[PDB]
Swiss-Prot record:
This is Flavin-dependent monooxygenase. Encoded in a conjugative transposon. Immediately upstream of this gene is an N-terminally truncated tetX1 gene that is inactive. InterPro entries: FAD-bd, FAD/NAD-bd_sf, TetX_monooxygenase. It is found in: Cytoplasm. The lineage of its organism: Bacteria, Pseudomonadati, Bacteroidota, Bacteroidia, Bacteroidales. Changing residue 50 to R: E.coli is more resistant to minocycline (MCN), no change in affinity for MCN, decreased affinity for NADPH, decreased growth rate in E.coli. Monomer. Pfam families: FAD_binding_3.
Length: 366
């Protein structure tokens, strides 16, 4: 390689891709939407499985650092009334597939690992266009740049996939509402104490509640349900409008959980989406281009596949792009994509499948 790569998106999947390339010498860049490095990343915690997510960290020398920040966490399962199954973390296993890390923390660990100015902040890729030998990358109100390989690694809603595949995202039919509570122990004591330093999942009448009670000192919860045919007709801008819907749905549940709803300051309602690995991707492409993470195989969050498969993506493509066991870039990508279409479709089938089971009328996590 006498060339350069451009990864669109500073996600955990993108930044990883960046490290694994950079430590092999390959000249690389990460164009990130976010306005600066201390931008707050909304969402839960992530857990890197020992088979996969962890392996990539290993190969970047960051596995250790990952544990250092990660927190092993037990899981309580609950009725609407009260407790059902507790499960602590047995010390034989607290260093594996469990350790829940804060999304920002992971990025901090990743940004450290990269040379300075590897990530160009406030760069919102609006358009991608292939020239003679280089792609031309267009960013909203910033100068364009060019590169010899673009790796799309920029979210399940990537607006810029066209050169790789005509496939488009699809809503699965469920919906998720997600929120944070700061100082959970004061603002939802009832709920905090039901968690008891442990994650919490409870299900009742095709309504699922999940919670982590300790995400860097804030509780993050999720509510889930098949999308109402009524929908759409809840305003995620008016908190009163969201609260009123959740209370109608959650009327049955204990006083403790209703506190949680009534306390949340603001909600983030996004539908469950899939970007299916259905057709093979375009086999004639103007220049070399590929996709990793959710830009590749966006799938329902109901299985902890997601970041893990996506990190595997980096591990594989990065190896391919460095070992010198391929004759052209085309071939190295075209090979990574074969493998991903395999464990990828697996991960998706699994997630879809878990999705179906949970919202089935009468479900218990036991
Ligand atoms: C509610 C919820 C819960 C989830 N829970 C889990 C889980 O528990 N375990 C798991 O493995 N997965 C989970 N997922 C999926 C998980 O978040 C993703 O797999 C992973 O975070 C996505 O990694 P990524 O870097 O490929 O995507 P992203 O993290 O979305 O990274 C893309 C990056 O590109 C940036 N970007 C977007 N557009 C542009 C652009 N135009 N130009 C430049 N940059 C851009 C974004 O800002 C972002 O920084 C969950 C998803 C949701 C919605
Ligand atoms: C966003 N939503 C889907 C869930 C959610 O709201 C969570 C949260 N911390 O509040 C999660 O734990 C989740 O985001 C989350 O992390 C889950 C998770 O890790 C997981 C894995 O890895 C394997 C099997 C299962 Cl059944 C799960 C499971 C159900 O615990 C999911 C739940 C989701």
């Amino acid at each position: 390689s006498d060339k350069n790569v451009a990864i669109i998106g500073g996600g955990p999947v993108g930044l990883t891709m960046a490290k694994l390339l950079q430590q092999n010498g390959i000249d690389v860049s990460v164009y990130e939407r976010d306005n600066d490095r201390e931008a707050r990343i909304f969402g839960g915690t992530l857990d890197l499985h020992k088979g996969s997510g962890q392996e990539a960290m290993k190969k970047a020398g960051l596995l250790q650092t990952y544990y250092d920040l990660a927190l092993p966490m037990g899981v309580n399962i609950a009725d609407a009334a009260g407790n059902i199954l507790s499960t602590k973390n047995v010390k034989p296993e607290n260093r594996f597939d469990n350790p829940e890390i804060n999304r920002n923390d992971l990025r901090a660990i990743l940004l450290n690992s990269l040379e300075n100015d590897t990530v160009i902040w406030d760069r919102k890729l609006v358009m991608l266009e292939p020239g003679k030998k280089k792609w031309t990358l267009t960013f909203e109100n910033k100068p364009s740049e060019t590169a010899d390989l673009v790796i799309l690694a920029n979210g399940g809603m990537s607006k810029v996939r066209k050169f790789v595949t005509d496939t488009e995202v699809e809503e699965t039919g469920t919906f998720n509402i997600q929120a944070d509570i700061h100082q959970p122990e004061i603002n939802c004591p009832g709920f905090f104490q039901l968690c008891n330093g442990n994650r919490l999942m409870a299900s009742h009448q095709g309504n699922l509640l999940f919670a982590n009670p300790n995400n860097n000192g804030a509780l993050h919860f999720g509510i889930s349900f098949k999308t109402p045919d009524e929908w759409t007709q809840v305003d995620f801008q008016n908190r009163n409008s969201v609260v009123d819907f959740l209370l109608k749905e959650f009327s049955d549940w204990d006083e403790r959980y209703k506190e949680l709803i009534h306390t949340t300051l603001s909600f983030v309602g996004l539908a469950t989406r899939i970007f299916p690995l259905e057709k093979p991707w375009k086999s004639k492409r103007p220049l070399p281009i590929t996709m990793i993470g959710d830009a590749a195989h966006l799938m329902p969050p109901f299985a902890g596949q997601g970041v893990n498969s996506g990190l595997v993506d980096a591990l594989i493509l990065s190896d391919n792009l460095a070992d010198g066991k391929f004759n052209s870039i085309e071939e190295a990508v075209k090979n990574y994509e074969q493998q991903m279409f395999i464990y990828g479709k697996e991960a998706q089938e699994e997630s879809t499948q878990n999705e179906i089971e949970m919202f089935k009328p009468d479900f218990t996590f036991q």
